[PDB]
Design a protein around this ligand. Structure first.
Ligand SMILES: Nc1ncnc2c1ncn2[C@@H]1O[C@H](C[C@@H](N)CC[C@H](N)C(=O)O)[C@@H](O)[C@H]1O
Lengths: 4, 239
């Protein structure tokens, strides 16, 4: 969710 | 009988297999997507033990002819772990080195960016995105401030280039993490099987790019994203  | 094993990304392994049909020997090679740049040397069952920079000069009936490039730089399978990004962080990738460079981004307040050294056509692999391998839980459970370089590899692995490796002076084995974001990107992240880094992602052009053009990719954050991203998003929807 917190990554490209 | 020479055998060529091509990966969907364009790269390939070539050489004579042993009695067990395995890519094992001192004359095996991994050939990059340009079908010209290669790492020639010792491989065991397809795994690079000691590959030397070379050029695929020609091929006759499937038999390749390589000639070594000047130098003593050798490469080997060096898959990263959660804590080790590379055994030689300052040894650049020869294919990537001839296609991209880092400089100040053209995007205001975006820091450094990744630029093309050459004019190339659509679907060209330009850079590699190697990094340490961590879990999605670890990434999603921490502050955005620590996820500036995180890129999902698959359902179970996230690639990261954490401090101080985010500085070219500390790490230049790969440079994919230096490509900035754009909603009108000229590149995409794509899967890549690297002889040195193993399974990672690469930066591939979506179309023609010119020499010295800044390479950008759509970070694809769920529309949960940094402020600069949300700002550029508004500025994008509008105008
Ligand atoms: N379009 C953009 N506008 C402003 N900052 C950006 C943009 N795209 C990327 N960035 C910045 O770059 C980071 C992502 C990095 N993977 C990009 C390379 C980075 N600019 C560097 O100098 O190392 C983010 O955490 C931002 O600080």
């Amino acid at each position: 969710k917190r990554s490209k | 009988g020479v055998c060529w094993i091509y990966y969907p990304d364009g790269g390939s392994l070539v050489g004579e297999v042993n009695e067990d049909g395995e890519m094992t020997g001192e004359k095996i090679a991994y050939v990059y997507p340009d079908e010209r740049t290669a790492l020639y040397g010792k491989f065991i069952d397809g795994e690079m033990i000691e590959g030397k920079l070379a050029t695929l000069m020609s091929t006759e009936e499937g038999r390749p002819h390589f000639e070594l490039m000047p130098g003593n730089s050798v490469y080997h399978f060096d898959k990263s772990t959660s804590s080790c990004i590379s055994t030689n962080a300052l040894l650049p990738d020869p294919y990537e080195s001839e296609r991209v460079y880092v400089a100040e981004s053209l995007i205001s307040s975006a820091g450094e960016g990744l630029f093309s050294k050459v004019a190339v056509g659509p679907n060209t692999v330009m850079s590699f995105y190697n990094g340490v391998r961590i879990t999605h839980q670890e990434v999603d459970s921490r502050d955005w401030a620590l996820n500036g370089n995180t890129l999902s590899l698959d359902e179970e692995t996230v690639i990261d280039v954490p401090e101080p490796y985010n500085h070219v002076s500390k790490y230049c084995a790969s440079l994919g993490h230096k490509a900035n974001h754009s909603f009108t990107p000229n590149c995409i992240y794509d899967m890549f099987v690297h002889p040195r880094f193993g399974p990672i992602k690469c930066i591939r052009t979506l179309r023609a790019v010119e020499a010295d053009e800044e390479l950008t990719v759509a970070y694809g954050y769920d529309h949960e994203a940094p402020e600069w991203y949300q700002v550029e998003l508004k500025a994008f929807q509008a105008t």
